[PDB]
Amino acid sequence: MTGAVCPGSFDPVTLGHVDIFERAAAQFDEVVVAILGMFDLDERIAMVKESTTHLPNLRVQVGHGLVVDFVRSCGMTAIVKGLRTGTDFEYELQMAQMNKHIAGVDTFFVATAPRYSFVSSSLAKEVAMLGGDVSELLPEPVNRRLRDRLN
Amino acid sequence: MTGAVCPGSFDPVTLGHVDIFERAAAQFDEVVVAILGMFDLDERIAMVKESTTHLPNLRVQVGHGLVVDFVRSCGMTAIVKGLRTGTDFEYELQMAQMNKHIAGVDTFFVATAPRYSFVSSSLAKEVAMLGGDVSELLPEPVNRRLRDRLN
Amino acid sequence: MTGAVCPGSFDPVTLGHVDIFERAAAQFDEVVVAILGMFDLDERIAMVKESTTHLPNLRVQVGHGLVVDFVRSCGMTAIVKGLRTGTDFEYELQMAQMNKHIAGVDTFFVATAPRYSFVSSSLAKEVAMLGGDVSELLPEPVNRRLRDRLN
Amino acid sequence: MTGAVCPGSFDPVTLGHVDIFERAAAQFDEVVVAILGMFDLDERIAMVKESTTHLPNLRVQVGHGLVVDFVRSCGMTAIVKGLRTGTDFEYELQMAQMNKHIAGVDTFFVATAPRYSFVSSSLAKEVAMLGGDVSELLPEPVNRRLRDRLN
Amino acid sequence: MTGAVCPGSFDPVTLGHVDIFERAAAQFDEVVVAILGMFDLDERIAMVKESTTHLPNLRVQVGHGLVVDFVRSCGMTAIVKGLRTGTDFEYELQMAQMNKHIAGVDTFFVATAPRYSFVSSSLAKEVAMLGGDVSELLPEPVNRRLRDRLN
Amino acid sequence: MTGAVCPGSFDPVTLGHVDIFERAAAQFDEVVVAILGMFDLDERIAMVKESTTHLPNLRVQVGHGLVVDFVRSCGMTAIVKGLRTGTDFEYELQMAQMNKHIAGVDTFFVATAPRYSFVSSSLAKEVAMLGGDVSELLPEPVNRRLRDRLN
Numbered sequence: 024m025t026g027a028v029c030p031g032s033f034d035p036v037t038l039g040h041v042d043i044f045e046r047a048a049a050q051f052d053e054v055v056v057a058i059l060g061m062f063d064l065d066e067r068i069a070m071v072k073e074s075t076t077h078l079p080n081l082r083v084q085v086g087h088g089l090v091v092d093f094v095r096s097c098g099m100t101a102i103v104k105g106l107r108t109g110t111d112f113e114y115e116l117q118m119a120q121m122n123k124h125i126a127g128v129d130t131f132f133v134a135t136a137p138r139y140s141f142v143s144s145s146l147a148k149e150v151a152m153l154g155g156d157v158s159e160l161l162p163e164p165v166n167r168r169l170r171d172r173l174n
Numbered sequence: 175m176t177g178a179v180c181p182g183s184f185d186p187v188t189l190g191h192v193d194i195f196e197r198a199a200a201q202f203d204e205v206v207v208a209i210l211g212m213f214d215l216d217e218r219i220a221m222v223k224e225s226t227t228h229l230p231n232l233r234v235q236v237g238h239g240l241v242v243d244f245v246r247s248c249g250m251t252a253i254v255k256g257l258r259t260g261t262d263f264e265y266e267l268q269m270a271q272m273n274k275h276i277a278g279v280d281t282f283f284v285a286t287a288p289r290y291s292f293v294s295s296s297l298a299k300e301v302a303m304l305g306g307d308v309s310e311l312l313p314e315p316v317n318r319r320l321r322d323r324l325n
Numbered sequence: 326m327t328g329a330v331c332p333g334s335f336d337p338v339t340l341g342h343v344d345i346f347e348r349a350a351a352q353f354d355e356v357v358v359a360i361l362g363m364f365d366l367d368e369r370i371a372m373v374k375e376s377t378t379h380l381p382n383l384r385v386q387v388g389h390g391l392v393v394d395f396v397r398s399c400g401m402t403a404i405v406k407g408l409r410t411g412t413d414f415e416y417e418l419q420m421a422q423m424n425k426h427i428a429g430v431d432t433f434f435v436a437t438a439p440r441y442s443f444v445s446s447s448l449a450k451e452v453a454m455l456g457g458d459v460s461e462l463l464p465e466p467v468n469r470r471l472r473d474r475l476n
Numbered sequence: 477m478t479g480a481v482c483p484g485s486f487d488p489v490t491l492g493h494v495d496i497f498e499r500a501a502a503q504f505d506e507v508v509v510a511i512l513g514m515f516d517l518d519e520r521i522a523m524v525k526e527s528t529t530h531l532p533n534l535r536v537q538v539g540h541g542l543v544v545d546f547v548r549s550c551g552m553t554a555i556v557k558g559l560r561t562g563t564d565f566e567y568e569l570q571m572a573q574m575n576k577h578i579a580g581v582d583t584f585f586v587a588t589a590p591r592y593s594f595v596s597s598s599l600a601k602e603v604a605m606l607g608g609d610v611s612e613l614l615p616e617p618v619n620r621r622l623r624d625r626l627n
Numbered sequence: 628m629t630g631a632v633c634p635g636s637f638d639p640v641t642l643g644h645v646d647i648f649e650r651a652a653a654q655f656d657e658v659v660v661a662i663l664g665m666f667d668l669d670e671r672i673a674m675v676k677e678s679t680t681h682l683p684n685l686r687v688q689v690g691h692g693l694v695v696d697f698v699r700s701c702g703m704t705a706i707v708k709g710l711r712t713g714t715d716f717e718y719e720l721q722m723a724q725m726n727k728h729i730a731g732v733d734t735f736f737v738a739t740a741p742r743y744s745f746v747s748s749s750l751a752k753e754v755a756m757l758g759g760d761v762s763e764l765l766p767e768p769v770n771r772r773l774r775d776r777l778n
Numbered sequence: 779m780t781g782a783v784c785p786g787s788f789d790p791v792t793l794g795h796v797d798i799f800e801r802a803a804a805q806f807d808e809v810v811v812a813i814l815g816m817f818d819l820d821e822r823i824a825m826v827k828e829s830t831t832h833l834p835n836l837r838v839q840v841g842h843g844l845v846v847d848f849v850r851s852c853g854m855t856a857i858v859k860g861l862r863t864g865t866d867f868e869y870e871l872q873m874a875q876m877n878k879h880i881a882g883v884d885t886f887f888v889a890t891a892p893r894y895s896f897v898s899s900s901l902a903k904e905v906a907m908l909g910g911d912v913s914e915l916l917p918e919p920v921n922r923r924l925r926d927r928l929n
């Protein structure tokens with residue numbers, strides 16, 4: 024009866040994201056990854072799906088419009104997202120307060136695992152496009168598609 | 175089957191704390207407030223209890239030793255605490271990472287309601303001891319005991 | 326003989342902005358709101374004017390070029406702006422130091438009211454464009470024009 | 477008719493503090509330095525007085541109890557203080573919001589001059605006690621008393 | 628046998644940048660300024676060169692691709708860059724951790740001199756384009772080219 | 779001819795500290811660990827020594843008085859320390875600027891390895907005293923003495 028939505032662009036999903044999914048899935052009856060660029064929509068979904076097969080209570084959905092409308096429509100009960108820094112917290116803070124104001128929807132933040140603290144979709148992509156190896160920071164389903172898109 | 179522990183000294187509990195309790199209680203099957211100074215242990219418990227009677231799935235317990243041992247002993251599944259600022263986040267971040275490392279216990283943070291952003295037990299107490307009125311920032315059960323302790 | 330300039334794009338002005346105007350107007354003989362996008366220039370001015378009729382010592386002006394040149398030309402004596410977060414402070418800090426260096430013009434910062442901490446023109450607009458209700462965060466003169474522009 | 481209180485322990489006053497006093501005195505009809513340890517009360521007052529003789533609209537007073545009660549009793553209209561960092565801002569933010577809540581008293585912050593950014597009474601004292609020369613960071617009236625107290 | 632690379636766009640180089648170069652050159656056998664817009668490549672190089680003639684162990688090079696590949700190719704041993712704020716630190720932190728992960732290359736940060744804390748290439752340019760005088764914040768070789776480009 | 783001092787209380791030294799020592803030793807001809815409580819002086823030295831035998835150009839010394847006097851007396855050329863967060867940076871920033879002002883001594887900061895980001899002597903000790911296992915966060919020479927001191 025509890026449910027969390029983990030929203031993001033996931034372009035592509037990273038091992039930091041999967042860590043958040045696993046931790047959300049352990050505390051909520053259901054988790055919905057809402058995908059809201061380098062990869063098109065279908066690629067993003069497949070990469071998330073392929074990376075979370077070990078999470079039976081998690082489902083992946085494409086989202087549109089406000090996250091809070093997605094949460095309330097799904098009958099979900101909260102938003103969960105990962106935080107790395109105090110500056111992450113301050114921007115996500117404003118968004119969470121706003122979401123609470125407009126829809127009554129709450130947001131729970133989880134601290135990133137230390138080993139993924141410096142990993143983001145954006146930085147991974149910029150490094151990859153310049154010839155660096157980020158394969159230890161991404162799930163293999165992403166690594167596969169990444170190599171192909173840069174081959 | 176889900177359970178969150180909200181730990182703190184609660185000396186005294188504030189309306190910011192109660193806001194966190196209510197939001198935890200809405201997402202978890204059970205919430206345990208763990209009380210770990212101006213008020214003695216018994217006063218703190220009573221004040222928390224008196225302020226949370228509208229929360230049927232919440233219980234108040236005195237705690238001792240590491241929070242993570244309390245969580246695992248209670249068969250609880252997570253720690254929940256409130257955050258006001260980016261500097262709060264960085265100190266609580268270190269603690270959460272440490273707790274995750276030593277016990278595998280996860281921590282979910284919730285952004286304070288905007289109207290309670292500047293309220294803390296410490297600041298409330300210092301202002302109260304100097305003759306200021308913080309009654310709109312504390313539950314009435316606390317206000318009652320506070321007036322008595324300063325009368 | 327004292328005068329503060331409150332500069333910004335005010336696109337649109339928010340209740341957080343009006344709170345700053347009121348607090349500036351209480352401490353300075355004169356306040357000049359300098360307007361420096363969703364709404365054109367004329368709309369922005371009218372919205373500010375319509376929202377500050379209760380402030381007799383405040384005037385609204387369109388500005389061009391550096392804020393400090395506007396301040397010195399108006400014979401004003403300081404810049405006043407609102408701050409919500411430590412990350413706001415660091416960017417505005419650099420600007421204030423720069424303005425002090427180049428023109429000798431000082432900047433006074435005021436902490437946002439807690440209830441408007443998460444409100445900004447940008448976030449209000451993004452939420453509004455996606456169908457969310459931000460009417461409690463904006464003056465009615467803005468709400469009127471906003472509904473019209475989204476109707 | 478405008479008036480600012482600049483409160484602090486001023487133990488001892490630094491050139492960063494005097495910079496704030498000068499900037500407050502330029503924008504307000506009156507400035508009251510409220511002194512609220514290494515130096516006793518009388519030394520602190522004299523050092524502030526001796527360092528601000530070039531500020532005719534500034535007076536120095538010993539304060540007791542809440543700053544906001546001092547402000548309202550003096551018929552003053554605002555608190556002014558200096559800020560160096562984003563972490564300064566977050567602690568002073570909580571205090572300013574609290575002061576606004578309890579007494580309606582507003583706080584204006586001013587960014588430190590870059591050359592005094594790293595100067596505080598505490599750090600100056602610790603360095604001085606260990607044999608370092610901080611004379612370029614303090615007014616001469618303080619330097620005089622400091623040498624004597626360490627001779 | 629020690630060597631530091633100081634990378635950046637240097638568009639244009641500022642006195643804050645030169646301060647970093649001087650401090651790097653004092654601790655490392657060799658310093659390589661790697662230039663990676665208002666000024667074209669050739670102008671940027673000349674401005675850096677013209678501003679560092681007093682630094683015999685420093686050389687200026689145009690760079691391409693990842694900074695860490697430049698470092699390893701030059702047989703250099705570290706990256707050095709200046710930091711002004713805690714928010715600078717958090718973004719540069721992520722980059723440094725990433726660079727360490729992908730290439731084993733370390734990054735040493737140096738705190739800006741207080742008098743250049745508010746100076747950046749970007750802010751200097753925006754102020755200059757609007758008619759402000761930033762000549763005390765830039766080397767004369769830059770000031771010369773700047774006046775010409777705005778004349 | 780280059781030399782860095784890594785100062786601290788090292789009570790006890792952690793694997794985060796050793797990571798900093800190794801990275802300093804790779805860039806400087808010589809590294810001096812300056813030890814400036816749970817463990818007495820002799821224990822601290824031995825623990826540092828025992829944990830750095832793989833670093834031939836590093837020596838351990840007890841220090842007294844200002845770090846900058848130690849640096850200049852040793853004919854060393856810089857201070858090196860580790861940073862974990864933006865709030866670490868702001869406090870260490872003030873100290874570095876002060877040290878630069880009083881002695882001309884520069885400070886180079888290094889970002890902690892991600893896996894040791896949450897580790898500090900203080901937090902390790904508090905967790906250890908409460909029965910938690912921090913052995914993966916400390917060198918074995920420290921773990922040995924720690925077990926003994928808690929047995």
Ligand SMILES: O=C(O)c1ccccc1C(=O)c1ccc(C(=O)O)c([N+](=O)[O-])c1
Pocket residue numbers: 030031032057058059088089090091118448451452
């Ligand atoms: O969609 C919203 O709810 C929303 C609300 C206020 C302001 C902007 C937005 C967005 O456009 C948005 C888009 C994607 C994401 C995401 O990460 O998928 C998020 N997000 O905050 O998580 C937000």
Ligand SMILES: O=C(O)c1ccccc1C(=O)c1ccc(C(=O)O)c([N+](=O)[O-])c1
Pocket residue numbers: 181182183208209210239240241242269901904905
């Ligand atoms: O007890 C611990 O778990 C712990 C772990 C590492 C370091 C210090 C401690 C504490 O002494 C502590 C005491 C009270 C609280 C609380 O707020 O009740 C918390 N707390 O972090 O929530 C922590």
Ligand SMILES: O=C(O)c1ccccc1C(=O)c1ccc(C(=O)O)c([N+](=O)[O-])c1
Pocket residue numbers: 332333334359360361390391392393420750753754
């Ligand atoms: O105009 C300046 O003074 C200035 C100076 C240095 C760098 C950029 C600028 C701007 O383009 C600017 C534009 C609008 C505003 C505003 O908010 O209206 C502000 N502002 O900082 O307040 C600044």
Ligand SMILES: O=C(O)c1ccccc1C(=O)c1ccc(C(=O)O)c([N+](=O)[O-])c1
Pocket residue numbers: 297300301483484485510511512541542543544571
């Ligand atoms: O006195 C108060 O107003 C107050 C209010 C809430 C919490 C603590 C206090 C203090 O004990 C205090 C003492 C000295 C100063 C100062 O710097 O002189 C300040 N101060 O914040 O400026 C505050």
Ligand SMILES: O=C(O)c1ccccc1C(=O)c1ccc(C(=O)O)c([N+](=O)[O-])c1
Pocket residue numbers: 146149150634635636661662663692693694695722
């Ligand atoms: O080039 C990289 O190494 C790199 C790595 C990861 C992500 C982005 C990049 C960049 O595009 C980049 C470009 C210029 C600079 C610079 O300032 O010259 C830097 N820089 O971080 O210093 C980085």
Ligand SMILES: O=C(O)c1ccccc1C(=O)c1ccc(C(=O)O)c([N+](=O)[O-])c1
Pocket residue numbers: 599602603785786787812813814843844845846873
């Ligand atoms: O000793 C100084 O240089 C100093 C200067 C200004 C203010 C305080 C101090 C200290 O008491 C101090 C003590 C130990 C350490 C350390 O960590 O060993 C450091 N430290 O900053 O590294 C500083």
